[PDB]
């Protein structure tokens, strides 16, 4: 993993997907931006590399599952080693493609193990954004209490917005049918 | 994951396993400490939570594979939610136990997919520590160019120090026979 402007961009991009109002994210505990300092952060005023470690990792911990944080790092290695990747696309876009390919790998080699659900996002105001993202996990990677070693998050970007159905097979079929609609 | 004193302790613990001389680690490019400031940090004089994000994550990136960084986060969730764990042991020790259990899981359910090798460690002076750690990966998690999505590191602590043999089935047998000697 490497903390740079590519991570700042990834944070701002993922913040905009999961939160309707920015204040629900930047005023969260451990993040706590003042309205003025947040605007400074977004506009390129404060360097992420010199920012407090706990603050930067609280932003990442909120927007990403710990397995996704692993994928971010692995994608970074691939991204900085290939000039064709940097030439054609920004980092956050390559990461999404890297993540999608991991899902396709799970769907090909671990299909009977693929489980899905809906994730909730905690806001600064104390409330929850119900159905903030789709969660995909490998059931056997179970850690107890709804925790999984191998877990990913996707946002449904379809125009139609097919409602995610209940049931193991119904959800597996929904994922396989919405592969081009999720990011 | 969460940046706190448990992560500082984990960094100092893993630094001592992979490096013979501390200067080979703290004077590394992304880390860049001074002989005096490194001592200040070691004996609680410097707060890791307020330290530069790129600096803290360069220490973590050096000592851990990106998949291990995911395990650190997952272990943190388990650790901070179980009073029994917090009562009996520090976090770095629980992490090692968490990591060992992931290996046992791979050895039980993915044995034909377990591959092993030796890892090199880069020092501040420009040299390499040859057999710094044992690397264990799941071959099917191959990202290409010697990169694996699921990869872990162990240090052999046997009094005997059985030499890690060449060969897929021999290395597998070595791991299964040194399960109590590796950390």
Residue numbers in the entry:
A (entry chain A), B (entry chain B): 1 to 183
Q: How is this structure described in the published paper?
A:
Gel filtration profiles also indicated that AcrIIA6 is a dimer in solution. Each monomer consists of eight α-helices and four β-strands forming a β-sheet, with the sequence topology α1α2α3α4α5α6α7β1β2β3β4α8. The superimposition of the AcrIIA6 HTH dimer onto the C.Esp1396I-dsDNA complex brings the AcrIIA6 helix 3 into contact with the two major grooves of the dsDNA. Helix 3 exhibits strong electropositivity, a feature observed in dsDNA binding helices, including the one from C.Esp1396I. We mapped the sequence conservation among the 48 unique AcrIIA6 alleles to the structure obtained. The dimerization interface is largely conserved as are the DNA-interacting arms of the HTH motif.
Expression of the putative acr on a plasmid in a CR1-immunized S. thermophilus strain completely abolished immunity against the CRISPR-sensitive virulent phage D5842 (green), and even eliminated the residual resistance observed against phage D1811 (red). This new Acr, which bears no similarity to any Acr characterized to date, was named AcrIIA6. All AcrIIA6 and AcrIIA5 orthologs completely restored the plaquing efficiency of phages targeted by the CR1 system of S. thermophilus, indicating they are blocking the activity of St1Cas9. AcrIIA6s did not impede SpCas9, while AcrIIA2 and AcrIIA4 exhibited only a partial inhibition.
